Amino acid sequence: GAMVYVFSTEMANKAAEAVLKGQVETIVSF
Amino acid sequence: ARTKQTA
Amino acid sequence: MAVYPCGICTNEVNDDQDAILCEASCQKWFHRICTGMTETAYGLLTAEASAVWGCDTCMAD
Ligand SMILES: [Zn+2]
Ligand SMILES: [Zn+2]
C-alpha cells in the first residue's frame, strides 16, 4: 500500500510486546 | 521498515 | 572509514549486525542495540512493509 506508518523506538517496543499478546490494533490519526 | 534483516 | 556510521555510536553499521535505517527523516543507519530497540520490535518493523522507523532526534522534531 501507499500509506506509511511511522514508529519511534518507544512505539515499536510497545507495539512489539502487544503483538505477542495478540493486541495488534493501532488507531490512525492526523 | 528497512533493516539489515530486510529480504 | 565507515560507509554507514551509526547515527548514535558512529561505528560502522555492518550487514551482519541488527540495524535500522531512519527512513522518517535523517537516513542514517542505527545499530538496533544503540537505539534501545528490542529484538522483537526489530523483527516486527522488518516484517511491516508499510512501517518506517524514526530515530529519537528525528521523532522529537
Ligand atoms: Zn551504534
Ligand atoms: Zn533520524
Author numbering:
A (entry chain B): 174 to 203
B (entry chain P): 1 to 7
C (entry chain A): 338 to 398
What does the paper say about this structure?
We truncated the N terminus of hPHD by seven residues to avoid this autoinhibition artifact, and crystallized this hPHD-HD1 complex with a 5× molar excess of a 9-mer H3K4me2 peptide (Kd, 11 μM), which allowed us to solve the structure of this ternary complex (Tern1) at 1.7 Å resolution. In both maps, we observed additional electron densities in the predicted histone-binding pockets of hPHD, which allowed us to model the first seven amino acids of the histone H3 tail bound to the hPHD-HD1 complex. The first five amino acids (A1–Q5) exhibit an extended conformation, with R2-K4me2 forming an antiparallel β sheet with PHD β3 (A356–L358), as observed in all other known PHD-H3K4me structures, while T6 and A7 meander off the PHD surface, looping back on itself, stabilized by an H bond between T6 and T3 (see also Ramon-Maiques et al., 2007). K4me2 and A1 occupy two adjacent cavities, separated by PHD W366. The K4me2 cavity consists of a semiaromatic cage with W366, Y341, and D352 forming the walls, and V350 and A356 the base. The two K4me2 methyl groups make hydrophobic interactions with W366 (in PHD β4) and Y341, while D352 (in the EVND motif) forms an H bond with the Nζ of the K4me2 side chain. This H bond could not be formed with K4me3 because the extra methyl group would preclude the approach of the D352 carboxyl group. Specifically, the N-terminal amino group of A1 is tightly bound to backbone carbonyl groups of L382, E385, and A388, as in all other PHD fingers. In the ternary complexes, the PHD groups around the K4me2 pocket close up slightly around the peptide (arrow 1) and the Pygo loop becomes more ordered.
Pygo and BCL9/Legless transduce the Wnt signal by promoting the transcriptional activity of β-catenin/Armadillo in normal and malignant cells. Molecularly, BCL9/Lgs proteins function as adaptors between Pygo and Armadillo/β-catenin, by binding through their homology domain 1 (HD1) to the PHD finger in the C terminus of Pygo, and through their homology domain 2 (HD2) to the Armadillo repeat domain of Armadillo/β-catenin (Kramps et al., 2002; Städeli and Basler, 2005). We show that human and Drosophila Pygo PHD fingers associate with their cognate HD1 domains from BCL9/Legless to bind specifically to the histone H3 tail methylated at lysine 4 (H3K4me). Therefore, this is a prime example of histone tail binding by a PHD finger (of Pygo) being modulated by a cofactor (BCL9/Legless).
